[PDB]
Design an enzyme around this catalytic site. Structure first.
Site, PDB file in Angstrom:
ATOM      1  CG  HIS A   1      67.658  87.814 -27.215  1.00  0.00           C
ATOM      2  ND1 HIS A   1      67.953  88.187 -25.920  1.00  0.00           N
ATOM      3  CD2 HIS A   1      66.736  88.698 -27.662  1.00  0.00           C
ATOM      4  CE1 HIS A   1      67.240  89.253 -25.601  1.00  0.00           C
ATOM      5  NE2 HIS A   1      66.495  89.582 -26.639  1.00  0.00           N
TER       6      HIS A   1
ATOM      7  CD  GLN B   1      66.977  91.270 -21.713  1.00  0.00           C
ATOM      8  OE1 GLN B   1      66.127  90.798 -22.465  1.00  0.00           O
ATOM      9  NE2 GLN B   1      68.158  90.699 -21.520  1.00  0.00           N
TER      10      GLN B   1
ATOM     11  CB  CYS C   1      65.714  87.474 -23.293  1.00  0.00           C
ATOM     12  SG  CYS C   1      66.775  86.039 -23.208  1.00  0.00           S
TER      13      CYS C   1
ATOM     14  CG  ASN D   1      64.437  92.217 -28.312  1.00  0.00           C
ATOM     15  OD1 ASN D   1      64.602  91.492 -27.330  1.00  0.00           O
ATOM     16  ND2 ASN D   1      65.420  92.505 -29.159  1.00  0.00           N
TER      17      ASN D   1
HETATM   18  C1  LIG Z   1      68.368  86.551 -22.441  1.00  0.00           C
HETATM   19  N1  LIG Z   1      68.465  87.888 -22.094  1.00  0.00           N
HETATM   20  C2  LIG Z   1      69.322  85.506 -22.302  1.00  0.00           C
HETATM   21  N2  LIG Z   1      70.492  85.739 -21.839  1.00  0.00           N
HETATM   22  C3  LIG Z   1      71.509  84.716 -21.678  1.00  0.00           C
HETATM   23  N3  LIG Z   1      72.706  84.997 -21.200  1.00  0.00           N
HETATM   24  C4  LIG Z   1      73.749  83.954 -21.041  1.00  0.00           C
HETATM   25  C5  LIG Z   1      75.007  84.400 -21.845  1.00  0.00           C
HETATM   26  N4  LIG Z   1      75.394  85.784 -21.430  1.00  0.00           N
HETATM   27  C6  LIG Z   1      74.317  86.805 -21.615  1.00  0.00           C
HETATM   28  C7  LIG Z   1      73.067  86.379 -20.800  1.00  0.00           C
HETATM   29  N5  LIG Z   1      71.165  83.526 -22.033  1.00  0.00           N
HETATM   30  C8  LIG Z   1      69.856  83.184 -22.564  1.00  0.00           C
HETATM   31  N6  LIG Z   1      69.578  81.952 -22.900  1.00  0.00           N
HETATM   32  C9  LIG Z   1      68.476  81.577 -23.800  1.00  0.00           C
HETATM   33  C10 LIG Z   1      68.860  81.805 -25.295  1.00  0.00           C
HETATM   34  C11 LIG Z   1      67.692  81.393 -26.251  1.00  0.00           C
HETATM   35  C12 LIG Z   1      67.303  79.894 -26.010  1.00  0.00           C
HETATM   36  C13 LIG Z   1      66.937  79.643 -24.509  1.00  0.00           C
HETATM   37  C14 LIG Z   1      68.109  80.079 -23.567  1.00  0.00           C
HETATM   38  N7  LIG Z   1      69.014  84.143 -22.678  1.00  0.00           N
END
Ligand SMILES: *C(#N)C1=NC(N2[C][C][N][C][C]2)=NC([N][C]2[C][C][C][C][C]2)=N1
Length: 215
Positions: free
Chosen positions: A162, A19, A25, A182
């Site tokens: 994540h 990514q 993700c 992943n």
């Molecule tokens: C992925 N990659 C992913 N990244 C983020 N962020 C926000 C905080 N700073 C880093 C990038 N957030 C999320 N959110 C998901 C977590 C798992 C449940 C659904 C939302 N993913």
């Protein structure tokens, strides 16, 4: 091979992606589940577009995170999602560039695994295919994982940060696990994957936000 399954050996899983800097993700997780159902329904699969989701799923936050179910809803309402080739990944949100001529799959909704139910998740992985899931991947030991079955009681099931993809389950050396794809590159973990403890009190919250698309 015990009471288990590994979709990587069945053509239900595309190569591991990276990514990059983008917090996408959720998009890779969503595409992974969609790809699996495309293979189950049509017999063929294709890299679908994570960028399409990043740029067009307004309910989500682009490179700032998002939910897989929201992505599935979008594909449904949009009447399709583009292939990776038609809508390449650039690792940064841009204006929605969806083009119907590049449609490579679509879905008619989604289903969510009952929260915290690993038996139900197991049944879904066996009867449906790859399932989108979310976990706490904040622990340093998770990030530097290399081999074996990961199990760390410090994991917080109430802190899902994540999104990944359950592509199978089985057992290593007496340790039941989930095979997890992943999106941090093929260089991460074990060839891009991690074996996470299964039936160990829903470790890391593996069965707390699981879902799959319908086709
Ligand atoms: C992925 N990659 C992913 N990244 C983020 N962020 C926000 C905080 N700073 C880093 C990038 N957030 C999320 N959110 C998901 C977590 C798992 C449940 C659904 C939302 N993913």
């Amino acid at each position: 091979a015990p009471d288990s399954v590994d979709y990587r050996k069945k053509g239900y899983v595309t190569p591991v992606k990276n990514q990059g800097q983008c917090g996408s993700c959720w998009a890779f997780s969503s595409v992974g589940a969609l790809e699996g159902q495309l293979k189950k329904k049509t017999g063929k699969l294709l890299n679908l577009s994570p960028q399409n989701l990043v740029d067009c799923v307004s309910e989500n936050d682009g490179c700032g995170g998002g939910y897989m179910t929201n992505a599935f809803q979008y594909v449904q309402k949009n009447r399709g999602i583009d292939s990776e080739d038609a809508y390449p990944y650039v690792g940064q949100e841009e204006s929605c560039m969806y083009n119907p001529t590049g449609k490579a799959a679509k879905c008619r909704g989604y289903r969510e695994i009952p929260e915290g139910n690993e038996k139900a998740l197991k049944r879904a992985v066996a009867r449906v295919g790859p399932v989108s899931v979310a976990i706490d991947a904040s622990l340093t030991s998770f990030q530097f994982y290399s081999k074996g079955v990961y199990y760390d009681e410090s994991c917080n099931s109430d802190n899902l940060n994540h999104a990944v993809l359950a592509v199978g389950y089985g057992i290593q050396k007496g340790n039941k696990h989930w095979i997890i794809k992943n999106s941090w590159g093929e260089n991460w973990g074990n060839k891009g994957y991690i074996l996470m403890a299964r039936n160990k009190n829903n470790a890391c919250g593996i069965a707390n936000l699981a879902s799959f698309p319908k086709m």
